[PDB]
Amino acid sequence: WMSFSDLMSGLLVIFILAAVALIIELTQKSEQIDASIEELKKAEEARRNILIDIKEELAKQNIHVEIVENDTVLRIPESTLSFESGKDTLPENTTVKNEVRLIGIALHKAITTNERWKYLDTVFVEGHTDSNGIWYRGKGNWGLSTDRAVSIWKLWQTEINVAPKLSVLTNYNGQLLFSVSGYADTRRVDLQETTEEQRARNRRIDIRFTVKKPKIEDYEKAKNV
């Protein structure tokens, strides 16, 4: 038994080496899988980094925008960007025109930084109005909110000198990135909407960012086999 116990001790050492070597490989395979799980959340990470980039970059220029709706929408309040009442054109006060160029430049720089458009599906320029019914050539607030989003999107095309144009940027799938939306007063942020300071919170331009979603193969590859 003296030699048997010595022999069994030798077996224990060999199995200890195998167990720790097995654990070393299994451990590394875990961070491989863990890293792959973090890669599946990178599109939402890229979206959040775009919005923080726009807000921070414009904040250094005294331009207030808001990140809203679960860090998905860049809200441009009427205090920042105000259209003429009942009109889709910004006023000729030679400042809002300057004001809106810097938002387009900020929007461009945040999307093209780190090529985060590879995680974007569509960016929507959304026009929103208050409940005040107007006529507006018969189109109502539905045509007003749509025309304001087109008005903003046209200015971001022909009055900012960004080398990769906003109208040229593609998305994760290779199609063009931007879309234009109008929702009239059907997506109001303020429901009571009594005072003029509450109606004004509904008159806004919303930049909605939609990201690409992982496919089946993205999850199958994350198993790291």
């Binding site: 022999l7 077996l11 199995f15 195998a18 070597a21 097995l22 299994l26 086999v225």
Partner: protein, 232 residues
């Protein structure tokens, strides 16, 4: 608490062969060999143990209905009972009474017949004379070592079967490493199944062998007590 099943300790003796292809076939082969070795050596130990016991037991029946007063005329009545059973047998129980009779001396009282000895009964009835075949049997004393080392061979073989199943090195998938660990578990089950039977059978024989020795010694002292009581 989880339930356990002790039938996992039972080998499967249905598919015994000397060409095992699975771990359970190999562990049941080792347990069968260890059991067969155990059974054969128990039979051999019992064959020579019962020989001594029956050899002693005949005197006990021959000395049962004898008292202090009747020994005078039982000297030769017991002589033919010993003579009939001592046909050619050299140094068994029959010849020991033949050797014992000549050493009996009559007391000088003259009237009434009383019998004594010139030497103690230890020189006539002891382990060296009645059971020297089992007490010093060195093959018997080595049987627990045989069974122990048979289990140790099964233990080493099983564990190194588990060593062979290991899939190590860089660039090995989890499923393959999982299968290697399952092989290690499979080899360890062979090792522990053969070990538990090897040790248990070794202890059983070791205890049974030494129990037989004490039982025979208890029977020899019974002759020593009864013979010397009747023959001071």
């Amino acid at each position: 608490e989880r339930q356990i099943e002790l039938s996992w300790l039972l080998p499967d003796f249905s598919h015994l062969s000397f060409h095992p292809q699975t771990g359970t076939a190999l562990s049941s082969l080792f347990v069968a060999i260890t059991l067969t070795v155990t059974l054969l050596f128990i039979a051999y130990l019992l064959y020579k143990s019962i020989d001594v016991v029956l050899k002693i037991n005949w005197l006990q029946k021959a000395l049962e209905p004898l008292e202090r007063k009747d020994v005078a005329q039982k000297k030769e009545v017991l002589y033919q009972l010993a003579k009939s059973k001592s046909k050619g047998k050299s140094k068994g129980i029959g010849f020991l009474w033949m050797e014992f009779d000549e050493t009996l001396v009559e007391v000088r009282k003259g009237d009434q017949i009383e019998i004594r000895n010139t030497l103690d009964a230890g020189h006539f009835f002891n382990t060296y004379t009645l059971a020297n075949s089992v007490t010093e049997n060195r093959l018997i004393a080595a049987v627990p070592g045989f069974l122990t080392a048979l289990g140790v061979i099964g233990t080493f073989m099983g564990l190194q079967l588990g060593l062979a199943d290991l899939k190590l090195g860089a660039g090995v998938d989890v499923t393959t490493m999982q299968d290697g660990v399952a092989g290690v578990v499979n080899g360890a089950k062979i090792a522990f199944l053969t070990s538990v039977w090897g040790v248990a059978l070794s202890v059983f024989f070791n205890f049974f062998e030494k129990l037989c020795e004490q039982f025979i010694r208890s029977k020899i002292r019974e002759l020593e007590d009864k013979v010397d009581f009747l023959f001071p």
